[PDB]
Structure formats: C-alpha cells, structure tokens
Enzyme design. Sequence first.
Site, short mmCIF file in Angstrom:
data_model
loop_
_atom_site.label_atom_id
_atom_site.label_comp_id
_atom_site.label_asym_id
_atom_site.label_seq_id
_atom_site.Cartn_x
_atom_site.Cartn_y
_atom_site.Cartn_z
N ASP A 164 0.86 -1.17 0.00
CA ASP A 164 0.00 0.00 0.00
C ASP A 164 0.91 1.23 0.00
O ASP A 164 2.05 1.14 -0.45
CB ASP A 164 -0.95 -0.07 1.20
CG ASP A 164 -2.25 0.70 1.04
OD1 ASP A 164 -2.22 1.83 0.50
OD2 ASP A 164 -3.29 0.18 1.48
N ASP A 171 -6.22 2.98 -7.21
CA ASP A 171 -7.14 3.29 -6.14
C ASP A 171 -7.53 4.76 -6.26
O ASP A 171 -6.93 5.49 -7.04
CB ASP A 171 -6.44 2.94 -4.82
CG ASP A 171 -7.24 3.25 -3.57
OD1 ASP A 171 -8.48 3.18 -3.63
OD2 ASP A 171 -6.59 3.56 -2.54
N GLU A 227 -12.15 7.85 -8.36
CA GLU A 227 -13.55 8.22 -8.53
C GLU A 227 -13.70 9.43 -9.44
O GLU A 227 -14.61 9.43 -10.27
CB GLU A 227 -14.25 8.35 -7.17
CG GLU A 227 -14.53 7.01 -6.50
CD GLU A 227 -13.32 6.30 -5.93
OE1 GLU A 227 -13.32 5.05 -5.91
OE2 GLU A 227 -12.37 6.99 -5.49
N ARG A 249 -10.63 0.46 -8.37
CA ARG A 249 -11.73 0.66 -7.44
C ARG A 249 -12.94 1.17 -8.21
O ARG A 249 -13.99 0.52 -8.22
CB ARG A 249 -11.34 1.60 -6.29
CG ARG A 249 -12.28 1.50 -5.09
CD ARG A 249 -11.77 2.16 -3.83
NE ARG A 249 -11.80 3.61 -3.92
CZ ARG A 249 -11.60 4.44 -2.90
NH1 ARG A 249 -11.35 3.96 -1.70
NH2 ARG A 249 -11.66 5.75 -3.09
N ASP A 285 -13.63 -0.72 0.75
CA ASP A 285 -13.36 -0.69 2.18
C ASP A 285 -14.52 -1.31 2.96
O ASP A 285 -15.29 -0.61 3.62
CB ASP A 285 -13.09 0.74 2.65
CG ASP A 285 -11.89 1.39 1.97
OD1 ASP A 285 -11.05 0.65 1.42
OD2 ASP A 285 -11.81 2.64 1.99
N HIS A 308 -6.66 -8.28 2.37
CA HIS A 308 -6.14 -6.93 2.54
C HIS A 308 -6.69 -6.34 3.84
O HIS A 308 -7.79 -6.68 4.26
CB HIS A 308 -6.42 -6.07 1.29
CG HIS A 308 -6.00 -4.65 1.43
ND1 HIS A 308 -4.71 -4.29 1.77
CD2 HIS A 308 -6.69 -3.50 1.26
CE1 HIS A 308 -4.63 -2.97 1.83
NE2 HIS A 308 -5.83 -2.46 1.51
C1 LIG Z 1 -9.14 6.68 4.89
C2 LIG Z 1 -8.57 5.33 5.36
C3 LIG Z 1 -8.66 4.25 4.28
C4 LIG Z 1 -7.52 4.32 3.26
C5 LIG Z 1 -7.25 2.92 2.71
C6 LIG Z 1 -6.49 2.85 1.38
C7 LIG Z 1 -5.07 3.37 1.52
O1 LIG Z 1 -4.46 3.40 0.23
N1 LIG Z 1 -7.17 3.67 0.35
C8 LIG Z 1 -8.51 3.19 -0.02
C9 LIG Z 1 -8.42 1.76 -0.52
O2 LIG Z 1 -9.75 1.33 -0.80
C10 LIG Z 1 -7.79 0.87 0.55
O3 LIG Z 1 -7.65 -0.49 0.10
C11 LIG Z 1 -6.41 1.41 0.89
O4 LIG Z 1 -5.83 0.58 1.89
#
Ligand SMILES: CCCCC[C@]1(CO)NC[C@H](O)[C@@H](O)[C@@H]1O
Length: 849
Positions: A308, A422, A425, A504, A520, A578
């Site tokens: 990450d 990631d 959006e 995502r 998430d 994850h």
């Molecule tokens: C705001 C806290 C969450 C952040 C989590 C993270 C950090 O990169 N970004 C969103 C993704 O969906 C997650 O898989 C990822 O671990």
Amino acid sequence: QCDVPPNSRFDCAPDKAITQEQCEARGCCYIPAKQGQPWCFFPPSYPSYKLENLSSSEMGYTATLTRTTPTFFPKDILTLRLDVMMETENRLHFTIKDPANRRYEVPLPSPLYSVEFSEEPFGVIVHRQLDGRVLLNTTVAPLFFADQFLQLSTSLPSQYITGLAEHLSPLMLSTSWTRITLWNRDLAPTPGANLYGSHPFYLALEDGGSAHGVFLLNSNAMDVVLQPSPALSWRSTGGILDVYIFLGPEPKSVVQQYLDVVGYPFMPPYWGLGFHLCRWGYSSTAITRQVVENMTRAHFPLDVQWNDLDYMDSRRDFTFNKDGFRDFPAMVQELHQGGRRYMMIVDPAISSSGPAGSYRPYDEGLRRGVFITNETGQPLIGKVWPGSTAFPDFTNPTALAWWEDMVAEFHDQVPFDGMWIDMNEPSNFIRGSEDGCPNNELENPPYVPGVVGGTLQAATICASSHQFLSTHYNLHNLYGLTEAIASHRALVKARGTRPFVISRSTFAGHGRYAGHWTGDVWSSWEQLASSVPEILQFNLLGVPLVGADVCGFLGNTSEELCVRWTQLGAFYPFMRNHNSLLSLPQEPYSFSEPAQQAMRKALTLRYALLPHLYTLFHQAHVAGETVARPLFLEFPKDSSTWTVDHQLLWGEALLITPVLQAGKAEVTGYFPLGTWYDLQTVPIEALGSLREPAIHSEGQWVTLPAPLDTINVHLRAGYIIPLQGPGLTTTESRQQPMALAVALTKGGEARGELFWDDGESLEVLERGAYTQVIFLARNNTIVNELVRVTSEGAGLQLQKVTVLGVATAPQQVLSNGVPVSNFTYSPDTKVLDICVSLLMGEQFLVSWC
Ligand SMILES: CCCCC[C@]1(CO)NC[C@H](O)[C@@H](O)[C@@H]1O
Ligand SMILES: *[C@@H]1O[C@H](CO)[C@@H](O[C@@H]2O[C@H](CO)[C@@H](O[C@@H]3O[C@H](CO)[C@@H](O)[C@H](O)[C@@H]3O)[C@H](O)[C@H]2NC(C)=O)[C@H](O)[C@H]1NC(C)=O
Ligand SMILES: *[C@@H]1O[C@H](CO)[C@@H](O[C@@H]2O[C@H](CO)[C@@H](O[C@@H]3O[C@H](CO)[C@@H](O)[C@H](O)[C@@H]3O)[C@H](O)[C@H]2NC(C)=O)[C@H](O)[C@H]1NC(C)=O
Ligand SMILES: *[C@@H]1O[C@H](CO[C@@H]2O[C@@H](C)[C@@H](O)[C@@H](O)[C@@H]2O)[C@@H](O[C@@H]2O[C@H](CO)[C@@H](O)[C@H](O)[C@H]2NC(C)=O)[C@H](O)[C@H]1NC(C)=O
Ligand SMILES: *[C@@H]1O[C@H](CO[C@@H]2O[C@@H](C)[C@@H](O)[C@@H](O)[C@@H]2O)[C@@H](O[C@@H]2O[C@H](CO)[C@@H](O)[C@H](O)[C@H]2NC(C)=O)[C@H](O)[C@H]1NC(C)=O
Ligand SMILES: *[C@@H]1O[C@H](CO)[C@@H](O[C@@H]2O[C@H](CO)[C@@H](O)[C@H](O)[C@H]2NC(C)=O)[C@H](O)[C@H]1NC(C)=O
Ligand SMILES: [Cl-]
Ligand SMILES: [Cl-]
Ligand SMILES: [Cl-]
Ligand SMILES: [Cl-]
Ligand SMILES: [Cl-]
Ligand SMILES: [Cl-]
Ligand SMILES: [Cl-]
Ligand SMILES: [Cl-]
Ligand SMILES: [Cl-]
C-alpha cells in the site's frame, strides 16, 4: 382523470418538496399516500412529446419528437430526433438526440423482438416475438428531455431485476420505490448509497425463465427509480438517450449480448488467479519479506505480495522512500527469483506542492498539459495523500503518453507486475478544489440525484472542471475506467505481457481492461454475506475478476470470521486478503493451529482448481461468459433460484454453499434438479496439514453439515473438472501433474474441457499459442478430444482420474487397453480412483467394468 392505481403513479415532483397548489399548477395530481409512493404524480394526459414524420430506413426507423408544452425543468429541448436501429436479431438500439446541437456522448428467420410506437404521448414498445410479451413500454410516463434532465420510463415484465452497480444490495433489486444513484463516490460500502462505480445496465427476468437486458449508454450522474407496478425510470442529468435492448432469451445470452457491446472481459495472467496478500502497514522491505517468509513457513500458497502507501516517498506515486524501502528493487527482484509477483498501489492524484524540478511526474505533467484544469486554465488542485495534488485527464491523448512514461520509467527502477489503481472516482479529501468551485449550472444543476452529501462535488473535484473530451460533469463516471484503460496500455508497453490492473472505480465496459475489488468493507458477518451478491453482480456486468478484501478491511476481524471469509473468499475469482492500518493482523499464519488448517485447506482447493478457474476465464474472454454466476443464470427455468444470492456457481458445474453467520455448524442451500457430488470425495493433495457422497435433488432446499473447518462445494453430475497438483506459487503448481474429476450422470455421461497457454503472453488466441482439450465420459469410458495441441500443452501429464457415481465395483480398469497399476473403489462413496500415466495432448481411452 387522476384515477391512477398507487403503484403506477410516476413522480411529478422529483426535483423539490411540493405543495398541493404547486403540484396542480404543474398540471399534476395530488393524492396523499395512505401510509416512497409520490403524492404528486402525472395524469395520463400530462404533456409529453408527439411522434411525427416516422419513416423507414434500411437500418430501422427515424422520427421527430415534438413537445408543445414546457415542463417545470429549464431548457426543455422541444424538437428531438429518434433513430431506431435493428442491429442484430438479438440487439435493438435506439437514440433520442437534439438534431440542432451535438450533445455529449460517451466515447465507445426474424429478430427476437418487434417494435411499435405510441404517437401521443410518444412511447417505444418492444415485444418479445415468441410469446408477445411487453418488455419495454416507454408510454407509461412522459418523456423529459431538458439540457440537464433526461427522463425515460418503462414498465418491467416482472418484479425481478438485477444490475445498476455499484450498490450494497441483494442481487435482485427492490422495486418498492427504490432510488438507485449512479455517481462514482469514495464511500465505505453501505446500503442506499452511491458507491465507487456506475453500470447503467439491468437484466430483467420474465415469467417462464426468459430474460432481457437494457443498457443506457450515459455517463452522467443519474437516478434509477423502481416502483412496484412494476416499472423503472431513468433520470439522467445530461447527455442523450442511447438505449440498447438485448433479447436473450437466456439470462446467459443477455449477458453475452451486453458484452458484445461493452467488450468481453480481458484474459488475466494465470498468476493473477493465485492468492494475493496485502495490508496497509508493511512499512519496510524487511517486514514485507517476513510476510512471504511466514506464509512459506506455514505452507500457505502466495502468488503475489502487495504494498500500500507504505512504499512511497511522502505518499507520492512513482517514488520509494529511502528508509524502510531503500532496497525496494532488490526485494521485488527476490520475489521474482522465488517464482512470485509484486503489486503496489497507485493513486491518480499527483503532488503539486514540491519544488519545481524536484518531482518529475508533476513537472512533466505540467509541461505536457496532462492535468484537469479550472476556469482560468490552471490545474485544478485538491487534497489527497501527498497533500496538494493535480488530477490527470485520462481522456487526453498526451496524458496517456505521459502515464505510459511514468509507468515505464518507474518499472525500470522497480519491476512490478501490475497496478493497483485506487482513489479513481476521483477521490478528493476536500469539496471541489482548494479554491472552491465556481457558481454555475454544472456545479448547481436543476436536478441533483440522491448522491451522498447532496452535491456532485462531495469527496470529488468540481463538476465544471475541464478535460480534453468534455467537462467533468459528463465524464466523472468514466474517470476510473479511463485510468484503467491508460494503465492497461502502460503495462503492456512496459512489460510486453498481459497486464494486471485492479481498479476501485469502474464503469460499463471496465471488465475489458481491468478487475475490481469491492473496496473498504467492514470485518463483519453482514459484510461477508453481502460480498456474494456483489461478486455475482460484477460477473453479470462483465467484470469477472472481482472479489472483496478477504477477512474484511475496516475494523478487527475475528478468528471465526476469517475462517469463513477465507473459505468463501477462495471462491472469489480475484482473491486478496487486505487489511487496514489500524487493524489487528489477519494473515493466514497469524491465527491458531485449527484455524490455519481450515485456511490452508481453502487455499489448497483453490490452487487445485486453478486450471478450471483459468478455463472459465478463457470462456469469459472468448464467449462473454460469467465466471462466478448465480443459480438463476444456470437454472433460469426454476424460479426458486431467482432469489438465491448467498450461494454461487463457478461456471456450470461447481456449486459453493458458504456459511455466512457466526456460530453456525450447518448451512441450508438450494439444489436445482439433478445429482450433486460432494467435492470432499475427490482426493486432493496438500503440502501442510488440513456426509452424503451425493445429493439427489428434485429442486429443493437441503440442510448440510458445515463445521468450522468445512466449506460446502458440490460438483454437478455430467461435468469433468481438471485439477493440478499443489504448490506455494503458480510457478510451482503449473509444473505439477494433473487430475480429472468426473461426475457421471445416472446415464453414465460427462463432459469437460481444459484451456492451457503460457499463462502471461499477449495475443495467444490470435497466434494459436495454446492447447484446448475436451473430455468425454460415455459407456464406462473416458476419452479426450484434441481441439488444438501446441507446445504449450503438449507435456501436460495426467496421473489421476476420479470418477464419481460409479454404482458397482469394477473388475478391470484399463488405460489404453492395459490394466492400470492401481485403482481403488469405495462401496460407500461410489468413487472410482484410478492411477494413470497419460498426456493431456495425446488421445487416450480409460475404461472400466
Ligand atoms: C481513509 C482510510 C482508508 C484508506 C485505505 C487505502 C489506503 O491506500 N485507500 C482506499 C483503498 O480502498 C484501501 O484499500 C487502501 O488501503
Ligand atoms: C403501454 O403503456 C400505455 C400506458 O400505460 C398503455 O396504454 C394505455 O392503456 C390503458 C389501460 O389499458 C388505457 O386505458 C383504457 O382505455 C380503454 C379503451 O378506451 C378502456 O376500455 C379501458 O377501460 C381503459 O380505460 C389508456 O387509454 C392507454 N393510455 C395511453 C397513454 O395510450 C398501453 O396499453 C401499453 N402498451 C402495451 C402494448 O402494453
Ligand atoms: C485555478 O487553480 C489555480 C491553481 O492552479 C488557483 O490558483 C490559486 O489562487 C489563489 C488565490 O486566488 C492563491 O492563493 C493565494 O495565496 C497567497 C500566498 O501563497 C496569498 O498571498 C493570497 O492571499 C492567496 O490566498 C493560490 O496560491 C493559487 N494556487 C496555486 C497552487 O498557485 C486558481 O485560483 C484557480 N482558479 C479559479 C478561479 O478557481
Ligand atoms: C414533417 O415533414 C414535412 C414535409 O417535409 C418534407 O419531406 C420530408 C420527407 C423531408 O425530406 C423534408 O426535408 C421536406 O421538407 C414538413 O413540412 C414541410 O416543411 C418544409 C420545410 O420547412 C416546407 O417547405 C413545406 O411547406 C412543408 N411541406 C408539407 C407538405 O407540409 C414538416 O415540418 C415535418 N414535421 C415536423 C414536425 O418536423
Ligand atoms: C482493533 O483492535 C485494536 C487493538 O485492540 C487491542 O489489542 C488486541 C490484541 C485485542 O486484545 C483487543 O481487545 C485490545 O483492545 C484497537 O486499538 C485499541 O483502541 C483502544 C481504545 O480506542 C486503545 O485504548 C488501545 O490502546 C488500542 N490498542 C492498541 C494496543 O493499539 C482498535 O480500536 C480496534 N479497532 C476497532 C474499530 O475495533
Ligand atoms: C512473522 O513471524 C515472526 C515469528 O513468528 C513474527 O515475529 C515475532 O513476533 C512476536 C510478537 O508476536 C515477537 O515477540 C517476537 O520477537 C517474534 N518472534 C520471532 C521468532 O522473531 C513476525 O511478527 C511475523 N512477521 C509478519 C510480518 O507477519
Ligand atoms: Cl400542502
Ligand atoms: Cl414549479
Ligand atoms: Cl461536450
Ligand atoms: Cl425481489
Ligand atoms: Cl521483470
Ligand atoms: Cl476535442
Ligand atoms: Cl422455494
Ligand atoms: Cl428456506
Ligand atoms: Cl472444505
């Protein structure tokens, strides 16, 4: 005149709260509900468009639609053009456009249908020819077509509709006045909210097991409103009406027909199907190395190690820190030497705050004009992980070239094998930009869909910002897709083998370029149960490479939850565990001994089935099939399957019935008519340590024993599954001998197939660089049929054949006419286990009696 049955009332005040006097001033009916259902609704006489000058081309029909009376929305377009194209026997296509102005468009012996038209009010009517059933009828409600408001409605053929991702919902959508909002949004999955992706497609079931699909090629923010009549309304905030109807008639054919338009799913590399392990908080290469060490120590397979934000320097793309990641390149090189792959996160937003000349991705981006710009023409600046950031415009050809360079250059430093994209959006920690957003109609539209935050700007960038192809207002829902496309191309150029992109945010057609994870999700029983319908939904939408974070992402997992999650998770097409930064560890090796056994077994089975899973992906790629599918897609004619979404099929043959609740030692699952063999009767080898043999169903619910260490998996009779020997990586397992599991029908028949290539090359099918074999069981024999044999599948060894449903013990078992060296038979389980020395690529004949 206002005599309309409650369930058939269409909302005449979707824009604002309205009083009776105002409702009637709009020319609508006011009747309060007795207990949702709109109080203000259209009379049958409400002004619509009128059809005129309908004529016949060779393609289909064209006509003019005229509105005489303005609606309550501003900027009505009073003259429209209708084009109806009868493209194939399966696919009908119609557009409604403004003939005076090019509007925004998303950049992309008889037919089964017939089409009529209502003149006044205007409506399109689509029948299924075979049975005369009305599938589409747009007369049910007025047509709205204003600059920033399109509304098209239709009756539905039944209460059973699926699609319209991405939402946390049952597979079959509720028709009780449900508002489904399509506006890509960074939010932890929760019901009733717009999530990461938008797919304006639905599949509707018809009494008897036929189905059709409707696709609205529109990328603007929209609401889809379902009512119990039943009926559906598209409400978009821009673009045109570009409608495809797919006639099926089979649910599988609907999906296939839809994918003909949006694109067949990409073929993943074989290794992508292995186990992925990741978390936020592997803060060094030393810790990261320990993960692989600890997995290997405990005999857990692991194909891909992920990182990450940890790897980055100050949370910026295309860098690595010189603390815990000083030796990043060497770590990745080492993973490769072990036969494993590496994935790391990539964000879209690029740090803009650094000193000039000190951070190349921004410096080059600036030079080449790759960023989304604001009113004065400067880059739009938001806040994300690195801090102040610009957002690339992936509709800009120059941006694509810049992205290819950044990926290629970074790959020269660190040879990653794919990209985890990631926050696309795109996600923004603040509303709009650091400088707010201007006051205009794009930022404040006359109709705002039911988005979380009540504004199109919440958690994203300004709607009125500029991209190469259009404003963000139109393109927002494509952002993630365009990045997927950009990333796919970049990895092909940088690596010269099949790309692996997990994204995502997604849109219709995403599956042609990348896979997806459901974001998430909480470490909860509720979220575990919800992942099944979500995974199934994405298969219907042609994104078969999908899964949820195994054991959950947010919060702390429990030992029981992680066991159940891994059990089911092993049946996600994309399987990644994850974990979040503040969560307790959830790697397989971090749990007690009994729990590790259960998890090891799940990963063992998955690895055994990879040749099958890979073949299923081959089918998705060439024929637009689903990998993980709901019962109803395989058994549409059995209406009991329609509401089943807590079980799943792999292809046609494998039925998985998971426990999805705490403290349960049994599970009740539905079994369609046929014989279902317990997979526990098929011998499976593992590297570490790790009930009726058959269910004869008439189409009924069955209670199954399901202790903690068991996941119920049944093999449908008449199907042959290929398996391969164990390994901690696919590099290892691909070298192992193979086996067959043969599930005989009562008539003693079965069919199966195997597809095989090098597992990573490009243009495999075009070049014919693969082996394709079919397996047939008939009259107490098993043979192979060579569809294609090349060097790739030539030396595949078949060493084991397991036959399920053999009624009586045989006296002789032959392989190519000679008694085999060893076989076993259980009177109990009805299983014949045969040892052989055969090649998948050479014709054989195994027989018994
Ligand atoms: C705001 C806290 C969450 C952040 C989590 C993270 C950090 O990169 N970004 C969103 C993704 O969906 C997650 O898989 C990822 O671990
Ligand atoms: C497509 O949908 C439209 C609108 O729902 C349907 O047309 C409407 O049908 C209703 C009810 O069947 C009609 O009311 C009826 O009129 C007849 C004849 O005058 C009368 O005998 C009945 O008692 C009833 O009052 C209504 O006029 C009509 N509305 C419009 C706008 O035309 C249509 O049936 C649907 N088409 C198909 C093929 O399903
Ligand atoms: C379009 O985006 C650009 C950035 O690319 C925006 O420029 C920003 O303009 C604001 C003021 O309008 C600047 O803030 C100023 O900061 C200085 C101190 O650094 C202070 O003295 C001033 O009082 C003011 O607060 C900001 O620095 C600047 N951003 C950058 C990164 O240069 C621009 O405003 C945007 N255009 C519109 C109309 O939205
Ligand atoms: C419906 O069409 C008529 C006639 O249009 C003509 O023939 C068509 C096939 C097409 O090729 C048109 O370009 C032709 O004009 C329209 O009424 C005519 O309008 C023209 C041009 O403004 C005018 O010169 C004539 O006097 C009209 N002719 C007749 C016989 O009415 C009519 O406007 C169209 N309806 C709508 C709402 O678009
Ligand atoms: C997830 O758990 C962490 C840590 O939980 C602690 O250690 C575990 C091994 C287990 O035994 C738990 O019962 C312990 O509580 C939580 O972080 C803790 O938060 C509390 C209260 O906010 C704080 O006082 C502690 O210092 C934290 N513990 C440590 C050692 O960091 C975290 O809150 C949990 N997350 C959720 C949302 O449930
Ligand atoms: C990999 O496994 C090792 C050994 O089990 C873990 O390190 C141990 O962690 C405990 C705390 O639970 C410490 O008290 C010990 O110092 C460690 N033991 C040994 C033998 O070193 C380690 O945390 C695991 N690493 C990862 C990344 O999971
Ligand atoms: Cl009132
Ligand atoms: Cl009004
Ligand atoms: Cl435009
Ligand atoms: Cl339902
Ligand atoms: Cl490499
Ligand atoms: Cl242009
Ligand atoms: Cl039932
Ligand atoms: Cl039940
Ligand atoms: Cl099991």
